[model samples]
Target: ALADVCRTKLPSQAQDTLALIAKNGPYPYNRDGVVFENRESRLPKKGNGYYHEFTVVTPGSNDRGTRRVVTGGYGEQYWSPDHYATFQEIDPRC
Candidate 1:
């Protein structure tokens, strides 16, 4: 099930990240658009390379922040604020 998160509900940084995803990115980090290996099985199982991830900037962090957005080729989108520890699916009706 998709999360109840709306566009306005997301942090400003997350909103920025989502915009970049929509534009196909001039992504801030090298890892953006890389395959996200859901090794912990947090999301439903899929074939390799089915999911791609993008970074969500952390305001004061020098490195890539813990926050991320993951997208599956099948139209599923998820948000993770603690690296890959957990995910909240993104709802399109935001």
Candidate 2:
């Protein structure tokens, strides 16, 4: 749980990313549903590759830079940008 944060906390694109997953939406992004590796252990304990990642594009920023989302088989959703800066748990039901 993310201290009461919800899908609204994400950017609209990120929210659509959630929406995309909402419908199991088709791929427009190259690495939309790929393994996240959980490399830093910043996230909670879960099985290997149980999580997959997506890029949340901010046109103001570089192409697909910084913003990212990680979703797990356990219904865990995390938004981590700034590359290891911090993680936010997002309630999928915005």
Candidate 3:
């Protein structure tokens, strides 16, 4: 079955991050585009390098913060605002 897309509006920060991703990124974080291990197994299991991660800038935070966007090799995207503890699929149509 397909994953459910988040019904709630994505934050502007996430939207900007998504835009950067579409452009193949000059991402602000060095870790952006790094392989996402997916150790938590919240997402469907896939081989290494099948997914990459990007940062979602947190307002006024000096560090990378907890928000992130993980993109699958097949173009599926997931958003995590509280690190990897939870995730929500991101719908491009939104």
Candidate 4:
């Protein structure tokens, strides 16, 4: 069941890095009074919980850019700046 669920959730063409980052399924538990029972719920789901939001390192130039994507479960509680800093230190490198 776990394998089936994984296969059903992940895309075959996902890059190794992306796949590794997305390996873990999104949280299935309820949090902060928010409930996500279905895979397609507005709340995040495994493999589709987040998306890429690109930002240019230099304005009006495509010379460099980075993504500031949404991290963690949407319905989960908000994170503190310190917590985020710690997480950033770890650098998922996804």
Candidate 5:
């Protein structure tokens, strides 16, 4: 649901940011045909200093709802680029 919203409703920057996250996050967990997890950074601004941070698992499951696939993780929490600085707060739920 959120992914669809992000792609359709969010700005280009947010969409792009989210795209990168889906490209590089955790291994994604599978539960009851659904996948979920916290977002882990793939690219830190410090040149590979602290890229992935495991934080909260955003309340997002697969749009199908039949499957909990993790398109990304907490990384999706960043509604704006400014929030990138607070990556430490986000962690994986599992």
Candidate 6:
């Protein structure tokens, strides 16, 4: 389960974030859709700016929380619920 994840299993807010990505959002956060440089090398090895990050709005928290979806230049996307400490490729089709 560490390698990847299904969309439905993600946090409800995370699901909304994915949909926002699909629709090319007028995203709520100013920082959403910014380049994720992959500085820690946690993701599949790619050049700098190869990934983009999106916010998964967290309710009850005072801020945007740690949840995020990092998308590569291609079609693949990954989710990290606890900031960038870990990641799992997301299976959006299922």
| TM-score top scorer | 6
Candidate 2 lDDT over 11-81, as tens digits, reads: 78888877777678685688788888777787777778798988777789757688887888977888876
**What tens-digit string does per-residue lDDT give for candidate 6 at 1-94?**
3587898999888899888998999899999999998888888788878899998888868898998999988878899988999999899876
Each model's lDDT comes to 0.86, 0.77, 0.86, 0.26, 0.31, 0.89
Stretches off by above 4 angstroms in model 4 are 1-45, 59-61, 71-94
Best by lDDT: 6
The CA lDDT at 73 in model 2 is: 93
In the range 14-81, model 5's lDDT, one tens digit per residue, is 34434445565442332221322233442232332223322222335433222112223324342322
Write down the TM-score of every candidate: 0.90, 0.83, 0.89, 0.19, 0.26, 0.92
Candidate 4 residue-wise lDDT, 1-94, digit = tens: 0111232232232222233335543322223113223243332345543422211122434543232112344322211122112112112332
lDDT for each residue of candidate 3 in 1-94, tens digit (9 for 90 to 100): 3355652488888889988999998889889999999998988899989999899999868889999999999899998888888888887775
Where is model 5 more than 4 Å wrong at Cα? 1-6, 25-76, 81-94
Task: Give the TM-score (vs. native) of candidate 5.
Answer: 0.26
Whole-structure CA lDDT of model 1: 0.86
What ranking emerges by lDDT with the best candidate at the front? 6, 3, 1, 2, 5, 4
Clashing pairs in 2: none
Worst 10 residues of 3 by lDDT: 1-10
